[PDB]
Amino acid sequence: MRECISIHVGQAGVQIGNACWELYCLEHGIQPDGQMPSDKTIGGGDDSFNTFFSETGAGKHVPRAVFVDLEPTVIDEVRTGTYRQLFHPEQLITGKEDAANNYARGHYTIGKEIIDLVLDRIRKLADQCTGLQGFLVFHSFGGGTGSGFTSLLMERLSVDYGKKSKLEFSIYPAPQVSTAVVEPYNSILTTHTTLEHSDCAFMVDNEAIYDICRRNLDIERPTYTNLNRLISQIVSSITASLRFDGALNVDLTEFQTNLVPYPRIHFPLATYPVISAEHEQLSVAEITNACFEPANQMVKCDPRHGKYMACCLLYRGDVVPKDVNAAIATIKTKRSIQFVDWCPTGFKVGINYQPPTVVPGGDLAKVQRAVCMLSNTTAIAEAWARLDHKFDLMYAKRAFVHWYVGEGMEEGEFSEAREDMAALEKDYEEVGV
Amino acid sequence: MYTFVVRDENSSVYAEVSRLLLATGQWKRLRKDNPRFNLMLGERNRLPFGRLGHEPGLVQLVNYYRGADKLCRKASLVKLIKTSPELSECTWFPESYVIYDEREVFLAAYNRRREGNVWIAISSEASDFIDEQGQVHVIQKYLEKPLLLEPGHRKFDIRSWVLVDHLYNIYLYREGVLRTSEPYNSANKTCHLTNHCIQKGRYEEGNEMFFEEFNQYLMDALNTTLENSILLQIKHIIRSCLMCIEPAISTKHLHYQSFQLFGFDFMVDEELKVWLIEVNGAPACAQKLYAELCQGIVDVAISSVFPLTSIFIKLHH
Amino acid sequence: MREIVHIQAGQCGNQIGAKFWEVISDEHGIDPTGSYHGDSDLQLERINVYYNEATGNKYVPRAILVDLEPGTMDSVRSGPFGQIFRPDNFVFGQSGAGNNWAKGHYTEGAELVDSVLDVVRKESESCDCLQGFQLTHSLGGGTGSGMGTLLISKIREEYPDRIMNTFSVMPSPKVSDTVVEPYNATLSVHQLVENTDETYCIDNEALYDICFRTLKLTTPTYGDLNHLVSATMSGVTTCLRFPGQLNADLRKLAVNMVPFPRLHFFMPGFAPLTSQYRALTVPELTQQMFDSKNMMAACDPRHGRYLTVAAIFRGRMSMKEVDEQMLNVQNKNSSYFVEWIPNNVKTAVCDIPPRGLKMSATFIGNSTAIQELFKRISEQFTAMFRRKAFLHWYTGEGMDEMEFTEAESNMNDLVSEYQQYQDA
Amino acid sequence: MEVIELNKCTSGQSFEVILKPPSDPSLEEIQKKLEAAEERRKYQEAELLKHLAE
Numbered sequence A: 001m002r003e004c005i006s007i008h009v010g011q012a013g014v015q016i017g018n019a020c021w022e023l024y025c026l027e028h029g030i031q032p033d034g035q036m037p038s039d040k041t042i043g044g045g046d047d048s049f050n051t052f053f054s055e056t057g058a059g060k061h062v063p064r065a066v067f068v069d070l071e072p073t074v075i076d077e078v079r080t081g082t083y084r085q086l087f088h089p090e091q092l093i094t095g096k097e098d099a100a101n102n103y104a105r106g107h108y109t110i111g112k113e114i115i116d117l118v119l120d121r122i123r124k125l126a127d128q129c130t131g132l133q134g135f136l137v138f139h140s141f142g143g144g145t146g147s148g149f150t151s152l153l154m155e156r157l158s159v160d161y162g163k164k165s166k167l168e169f170s171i172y173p174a175p176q177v178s179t180a181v182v183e184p185y186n187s188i189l190t191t192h193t194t195l196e197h198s199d200c201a202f203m204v205d206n207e208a209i210y211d212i213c214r215r216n217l218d219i220e221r222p223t224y225t226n227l228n229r230l231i232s233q234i235v236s237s238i239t240a241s242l243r244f245d246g247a248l249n250v251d252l253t254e255f256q257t258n259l260v261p262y263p264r265i266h267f268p269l270a271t272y273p274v275i276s277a278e279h280e281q282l283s284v285a286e287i288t289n290a291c292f293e294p295a296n297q298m299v300k301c302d303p304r305h306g307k308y309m310a311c312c313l314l315y316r317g318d319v320v321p322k323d324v325n326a327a328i329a330t331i332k333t334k335r336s337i338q339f340v341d342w343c344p345t346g347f348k349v350g351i352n353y354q355p356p357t358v359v360p361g362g363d364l365a366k367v368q369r370a371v372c373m374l375s376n377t378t379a380i381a382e383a384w385a386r387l388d389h390k391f392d393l394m395y396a397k398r399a400f401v402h403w404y405v406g407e408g409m410e411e412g413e414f415s416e417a418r419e420d421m422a423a424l425e426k427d428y429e430e431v432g433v
Numbered sequence B: 001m002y003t004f005v006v007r008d009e010n011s012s013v014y015a016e017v018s019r020l021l022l023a024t025g026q027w028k029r030l031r032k033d034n035p036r037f038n039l040m041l042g043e044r045n046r047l048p049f050g051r052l053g054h055e056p057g058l059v060q061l062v063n064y065y066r067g068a069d070k071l072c073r074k075a076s077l078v079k080l081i082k083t084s085p086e087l088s089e090c091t092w093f094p095e096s097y098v099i100y101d102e103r104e105v106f107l108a109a110y111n112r113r114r115e116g117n118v119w120i121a122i123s124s125e126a127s128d129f130i131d132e133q134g135q136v137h138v139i140q141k142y143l144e145k146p147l148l149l150e151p152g153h154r155k156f157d158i159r160s161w162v163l164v165d166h167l168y169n170i171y172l173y174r175e176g177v178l179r180t181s182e183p184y185n186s187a188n189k190t191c192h193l194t195n196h197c198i199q200k201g202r203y204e205e206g207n208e209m210f211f212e213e214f215n216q217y218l219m220d221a222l223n224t225t226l227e228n229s230i231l232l233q234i235k236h237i238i239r240s241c242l243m244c245i246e247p248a249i250s251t252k253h254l255h256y257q258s259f260q261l262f263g264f265d266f267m268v269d270e271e272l273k274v275w276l277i278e279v280n281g282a283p284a285c286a287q288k289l290y291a292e293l294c295q296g297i298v299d300v301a302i303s304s305v306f307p308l309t310s311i312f313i314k315l316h317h
Numbered sequence C: 001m002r003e004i005v006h007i008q009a010g011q012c013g014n015q016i017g018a019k020f021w022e023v024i025s026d027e028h029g030i031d032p033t034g035s036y037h038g039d040s041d042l043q044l045e046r047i048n049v050y051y052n053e054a055t056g057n058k059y060v061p062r063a064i065l066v067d068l069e070p071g072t073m074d075s076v077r078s079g080p081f082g083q084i085f086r087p088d089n090f091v092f093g094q095s096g097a098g099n100n101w102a103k104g105h106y107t108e109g110a111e112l113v114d115s116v117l118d119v120v121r122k123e124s125e126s127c128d129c130l131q132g133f134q135l136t137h138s139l140g141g142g143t144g145s146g147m148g149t150l151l152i153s154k155i156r157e158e159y160p161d162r163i164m165n166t167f168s169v170m171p172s173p174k175v176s177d178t179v180v181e182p183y184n185a186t187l188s189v190h191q192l193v194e195n196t197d198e199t200y201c202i203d204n205e206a207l208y209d210i211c212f213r214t215l216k217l218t219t220p221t222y223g224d225l226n227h228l229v230s231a232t233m234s235g236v237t238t239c240l241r242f243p244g245q246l247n248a249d250l251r252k253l254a255v256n257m258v259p260f261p262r263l264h265f266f267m268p269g270f271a272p273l274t275s276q277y278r279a280l281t282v283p284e285l286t287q288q289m290f291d292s293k294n295m296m297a298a299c300d301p302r303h304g305r306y307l308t309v310a311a312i313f314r315g316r317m318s319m320k321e322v323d324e325q326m327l328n329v330q331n332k333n334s335s336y337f338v339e340w341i342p343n344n345v346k347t348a349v350c351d352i353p354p355r356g357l358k359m360s361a362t363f364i365g366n367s368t369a370i371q372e373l374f375k376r377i378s379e380q381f382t383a384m385f386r387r388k389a390f391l392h393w394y395t396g397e398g399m400d401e402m403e404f405t406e407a408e409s410n411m412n413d414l415v416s417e418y419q420q421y422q423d424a
Numbered sequence D: 001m002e003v004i005e006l007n008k009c010t011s012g013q014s015f016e017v018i019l020k021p022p023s024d025p026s027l028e029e030i031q032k033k034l035e036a037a038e039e040r041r042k043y044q045e046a047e048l049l050k051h052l053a054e
C-alpha cells in the first residue's frame, strides 16, 4: 500500500542504497533469495513492509527500487553481489561513460540519452503500484551523475508524477572522504535546479559521518562502507515509519507537513547512540541529549546559534513515552532550544518498538534503543554558506567553467544558481534572526 | 610551526599578540582569507564562525566567542540580566529599561521615584533625547551617590580585563585600571563622564589610576582593602555574567574552539558597593599593561591549544 | 570509459614507450610472451585499460609503434618484451625525419600518417568505451615532434570527443642532439597548447640533473634517464590501471587538473629516486616527493604556485600517516597553493608497489612554475631566430617564418597566462 | 507540559508534547533546454572541425 519507490543515482546513492536495502532486509527478515519466512501471505500482502518491497508468487520480496549510474561498475557489483537475487535486471540500469564529475555532462549530454529509459523502468514499478506515495531519491551533490541526472530526473518526475511527493537523501561534499575540485559547482547547480522539485531533503555531510566513524567507532581511516552503514541506519530510522506500523511519518506527505514550514525551507537537520561493540547502555535522557550534541549531527552546524522551527524525535527500541517526556523537560531547562516566535515549541515524538538491527561484522553495536532527531534550524544554512563561498572563490576566476560551457551550459546557469543560493541564505537569515 | 591569520587591524591587543606570536619563531602569519590556519584573530563584525572547524586535520581557534554579544551590547545585556533565572530580575546592576519595548514600566518607576530620580541614556525629567536621536537605547538609573576620590572630589570607573580560554576557565588580570574624572557636581557636565575620551591629567597620568594607588587610598582613607571592599564583588559579578551564558557560547564539544578577552566596567558607590555598568567585547588596554596582558593571552589562551606568579586570578576551574 | 590507445612516435618516443610496457607488464604479471603469471586479482581487474585480451590468455598491449626510420623499432622488436606487441601495429617509413619538425609534420610524416591512422581505427573500433589516447614522444627531434603533433591533430579530427594525453620529453642543452631542438620544441608546444588535454612535461634537463647530482651518476646514459621516465609513467598511470577508491579516467583527471583549457602542462615527481633495501617512511616519501630535487621538469615549485596536485601512494603503509603528511605539506607551505581553488590537492593509495620498491609516491602538479621551462625554450629559440639561423632546413620544406613567429608568440603567451595566475 | 495525540500500537507509540504555544516546467520546455545545449555543443564541434580542416 502507499508505496514508496526509491531511486538511487550515482555511486554514492547506489552504494548507500545497497546498504540501506540490506539493513532493510535484515530488519524485515527477508533473506537474500527474496524469501521472507514470516510472510504468511504468499504472493501478496498489503502489510507495511510492502511499501518498499513487492512480492512474487515464489515468495520473493522485491525491493521497489531502481539503481541508476552512467557507468557499469558499482551497479555491476550489486548485479553480482550477495543480494543480487533480490533485485531484478531492469531495476539496475547502467550506462557507458561517467560524467567526469561534471553536472553539465550528466544533466545534458549523457543524461538525455538515458532519461527516458530510466523513466520507463520507473513506470514499470509505478504500474505495479496501487497507490504510489512518491519517491525517495538518493544521490551525491558532487558527482556528475549524482548532480546532473538527479536534477533532470527530478524535473521529469515532477512532470510525469506531479501530485506525487519526492524526498531526498543527499551527500554533501566534504574535502576528506574524497572530493573532486568542482563538487562545489556541481552542488550549487543541482540544488538550484532541484529546489522546487523536492519536498524534503535530508543532507548528510560526509565530514560529520567521517568524524563519528573515527571518534565513536575508532576507525582510523573510515571506508565508504563504514560510512554508508552508518548512513543507512539513519536512513532506516527515517524510513521505518513507512515500513512499520506507526502513526508518525507514515506518509511521505507527513514529513513535509511536520518538518517543512515554507516550501524552500525544506532541509531538516538530522542527529542520531553510535557505539562500538566494545557495554554502558545509554538512557532515553542520555540519547535524547546527544540529539542535542552538535557532534552527533549529520551536518556540522551550531544550532544554538540559530533558531528552531520544527523538531521530531523518532525512537527505536526500549523507549516509553514517559521517559521521553521527562528527558525533554530536563533538556529544555539545561540546553538552549530557542524557537522562532511563530512556531510552537513542542517536540513531535514517535516510537517504533522494533529494535535496531546491525549488519553482522559491522562496526556498530546492536543497541537496545536509539533515536534520530529531525529539526528545522536556520543553522543548516551554514552548510550552504561554506559551499557558496567555495563556489565563489572558483567562479570569480571562472576556474573549470570551460568544462561546463564545452558541454552546452552557459555561464549564466552558474550565476542564476548562485543567486538562487543567495536567495536561500537570506530566507534563512530571515526566518532565523 | 603554527599558522595564524589577522583580520582586525585595529585591535591594539591582538596587534601585540600577533607581534609576539611572530617573535616566538614557531608561528607564521598567513594572508587573511587563507583557510588553512591554526588560529584566527578575526574581525569584530560578521566574523564567519560558520566556516571554522572544517579544515581537515587543522585544529582551529578563534579569539571571539560567538554569542557573547548578548553581554556586550547594552540593550542585549539588559534583556539578558532581566530575563535570566540565574540573574533574578540582581543587586549589582542598576535598574534598567529598554526603549525604542518597555516604556510604561520606566514611567511607572519614575513616578514611584518622583514621589520624594536621575536617569541616563543624563537628566532628571523623563525627556525623548532618544527619539530626537538614533538607535534602540536603554534608560538606566544614574548613580547619584558615587564614591568620590577625595583628594580631588572625583568620579571614577574601574575596568577589569577577563580572559575566557577554550575550556571556559575565567581569568581576571591582576592589573585593572581606574579611569578618573574636573570634580563632581550634583547639579550639572563633562566630569560626570569618566571616559578618557571626554576627559581629554592633574592627579593621575592620563587620568588613570592603577591598583596599587587605589589600594593605598582605601587603606589610608577608609581602613579597607581593594580586595575586601571591591574585588570580591567584581569577581562575583564576572562569574555571574559569564557562567550565565556559558551553555550558549561554550565551544566545549564544537568543531572549532574559542577564547576571548572582555573588559568589564564597574562603578563603586559611597557605601563601597560595586555595580556593573557595561561589558565590552573588544577592549583596549592601559598602555603600561599592554605588554603583560598580551603575553598572558598567548600564555593561557593560545599556547594552551598550540603548545610551544601567574598574572591571572582563576575565577573558574 | 575504459580502454586507452597508446602511441609511440620517434626514437625517444619508442624508447620510453618500450620501457613503459616492460615496467607495467611486470606490474601486471604479463611475461614477455603475453601470458599472465601473477598472484593477485588486482593485477587483472583493470588490465583491459592497457591490454587487449587475445587467444589463449594472451594479452597484447594496445600500442601503435611509429617511426620514420626503421632503427629504434627494430631495436624494440628485438629486445625485452619485443614480441608482446601486435606485429601489425609496427608502422614505419624508411626515409627518416632528420631531427626536422617540418619533415615529420609536413612532408615525410604526411606520407606515413594515413597508415598510422589505419591501425588507430582498428584498435579504437575494437573497444567497448575508448577513453582516449596516450602518446610518447620527444619535442626536440623530428618524427616524434612533428609527426606526433600531426597525429594529435588527425586523431582529434577523427575522435574530437576523446582525451588526448602525452608524455612529451622537453629538450635541454645539457642533453642535446641537435641545435634545432628549440625550434622543433617551440613548434610542437604550439600544437600541444591546442590539441592535447594533458601533457606530462618530462624535461631531459631534470632527468640529467637527478641522474648526476642525486643518483650521483657522473656520466648518464639515455637509459639512466629512461628509468626515471618509466618509473614516472608507471606512477602517473597507476590509478588508471588499478582498482580502488578513485577509479580514475583520463577525463576526470583532466577535469580535476585543468582549471583553464590551455594550462594543461603537468610536472611529475617521484620518490624514492632509484637507479633500496630500506623502505622509507611516509614522511620521507612525502617530503622527497614535494622537493624540487625530485621534480622531472626543471622548475622550482617554490618559484610559482600549485593550481592543482594529485598524489599517488603505492605500497603497504598507513593511510592515516598519508593524510597527516599530505596535510602537513600543504598547511606548512600553504603559500605555494592558490586560494581560489579550494581543496586542490587530492591523494590516492594503491597497495601494489612498483618493482623493487616496497613503498613509493608519485605526484602530478599543475604548477605555474612550468613557465620556466617554456621561457627557457623561448629564449633559445629567439636567439637563433633573431638571426634566422638554421631556418633553411625548414624553409626548404615549405614552411615560412610566419609559422615560427606565431608559435613563439603562443608560447610566450602561455608563459604570460601562467604568470597571471601566479599573482592571484 | 501538554501531551496530545497519543496513538498506541502493538509496534509503536506516537504522540505530540507541546512545551509553549506559538506567537513547474514542461516536458517540452525541458526538452527544449536539453536540445539547446545539444545544438550549442554541435556549433563548437563545427568550429573545431572547420579549424582542423583549414
Ligand SMILES: COc1cc([C@@H]2c3cc4c(cc3[C@@H](Sc3ncccn3)[C@H]3COC(=O)[C@H]23)OCO4)cc(OC)c1OC
Residues within 6 Å of the ligand: A101, A177, A178, A179, A180, A181, C235, C236, C237, C238, C239, C240, C246, C247, C248, C249, C250, C251, C252, C253, C254, C256, C257, C308, C309, C310, C311, C312, C343, C344, C345, C346, C347, C348, C364
Ligand atoms: C590517475 O591519475 C589520477 C587522477 C586523479 C584525478 C583528480 C585530480 C585532482 C583532484 C581530484 C582528482 C580525483 S576526482 C573525485 N571525484 C569524486 C570523488 C572524489 N574524487 C580523481 C578521480 O579520478 C580522477 O582521474 C581524478 O584535485 C585536484 O587535482 C587523482 C589521482 O590521485 C589523487 C590520480 O592518481 C595520481
Ligand SMILES: Nc1nc2c(ncn2[C@@H]2O[C@H](COP(=O)(O)OP(=O)(O)OP(=O)(O)O)[C@@H](O)[C@H]2O)c(=O)[nH]1
Residues within 6 Å of the ligand: A009, A010, A011, A012, A013, A015, A016, A069, A070, A098, A099, A100, A101, A102, A139, A140, A141, A142, A143, A144, A145, A146, A147, A171, A172, A173, A174, A176, A177, A178, A179, A180, A183, A206, A224, A225, A227, A228
Ligand atoms: N558517503 C559516501 N559518499 C560517497 C560515496 N561514493 C561517492 N561519495 C561522495 O560522492 C561524491 C562524488 O559523487 P559520486 O556519487 O561518486 O559521482 P557520480 O554521481 O557517479 O558522478 P560521476 O562518477 O562523475 O559520473 C564525493 O563527494 C564523494 O565524497 C559513498 O559510497 N558514500
Ligand SMILES: Nc1ncnc2c1ncn2[C@@H]1O[C@H](COP(=O)(O)OP(=O)(O)CP(=O)(O)O)[C@@H](O)[C@H]1O
Residues within 6 Å of the ligand: B094, B120, B140, B141, B142, B143, B144, B155, B156, B157, B192, B193, B194, B195, B265, B267, B277, B278, B280
Ligand atoms: N548608571 C550610571 N550611573 C552613573 N554613571 C554612569 C551610568 N552609566 C554610565 N555611566 C558613566 O558613563 C561613562 C561612559 O560609560 P558607558 O558604559 O555609559 O559608555 P561606554 O561604552 O563609552 C564605556 P567603554 O568605553 O568602557 O565601553 C562611564 O565612565 C560612567 O561614568
Ligand SMILES: Nc1nc2c(ncn2[C@@H]2O[C@H](COP(=O)(O)OP(=O)(O)O)[C@@H](O)[C@H]2O)c(=O)[nH]1
Residues within 6 Å of the ligand: C009, C010, C011, C012, C013, C015, C016, C097, C098, C099, C100, C138, C139, C140, C141, C142, C143, C144, C145, C169, C170, C171, C172, C175, C176, C177, C181, C204, C207, C222, C225, C226, C229
Ligand atoms: N629522455 C630521453 N630523451 C631522448 C631519448 N632519445 C632522444 N631524446 C631527446 O629527444 C630529442 C631527439 O629526438 P628523437 O626522439 O631522437 O627524434 P625522432 O626520432 O625524430 O622523433 C632530443 O631532445 C633528445 O635529447 C631517450 O631515449 N630518452
Ligand SMILES: [Mg+2]
Residues within 6 Å of the ligand: A010, A011, A069, A071, A098, A143, A145
Ligand atoms: Mg561514477
Ligand SMILES: [Mg+2]
Residues within 6 Å of the ligand: C011, C141, C177
Ligand atoms: Mg635521435
